[PDB]
Amino acid sequence: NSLALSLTADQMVSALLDAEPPILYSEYDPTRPFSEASMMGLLTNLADRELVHMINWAKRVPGFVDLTLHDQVHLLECAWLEILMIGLVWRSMEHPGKLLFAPNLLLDRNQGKCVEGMVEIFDMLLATSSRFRMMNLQGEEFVCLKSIILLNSGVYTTLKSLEEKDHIHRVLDKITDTLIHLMAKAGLTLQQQHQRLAQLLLILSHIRHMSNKGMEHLYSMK
């Protein structure tokens, strides 16, 4: 019973925790003071390094590699900015009013004004940080949400076609079971469990929104 649909809730959580990517430091060369990237270059360089780790993370998510390659790339290309963003928010929760892009790159709102159009996006990320804090979002919950984003974001964008969408939805259902189990084990009532699951899933629409606005911005600054 090592395949994804065979895993218990505990085993799924455990597998997902094992797969967590490293949190990167922003690269710095004390001998190159003048070619320090702009704010945007610093974020771009970080993000590009994070993306290399993201592909490998996704392919460790039980179920993901059961999809055709084409479908894996599709889901990744749809979710990647949502995934960077939720990861960013997690690590920023202990820094109210700030975004911990890296342990050596902690930025305040007003540093968002360094790039025209970016502050709007910083504001939205900060509101997400605040929402997660007010909910006391737990790490195992954050980890399930990331996998949900990966499997969900591109699924809506022929027999085997339906077969693959069927498989994705089954893995999504297992991650929901996993979230519920975590909450149940924490001692929440059934009503608190359903209310909390819904609160967490609704934040995903905001994360989608933020990614749409970010992609728009990226595409504008081509």
Binding site: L17, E20, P21, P22, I23, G87, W90, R91, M93, E94, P103, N136, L137, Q138, G139, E140, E141, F142, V143, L182, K185, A186
Partner: peptide, 11 residues
């Protein structure tokens, strides 16, 4: 360093 070194965890 991973996400597991930040925030609160059920266990």
């Amino acid at each position: 360093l991973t996400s597991r070194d930040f925030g609160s965890w059920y266990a």
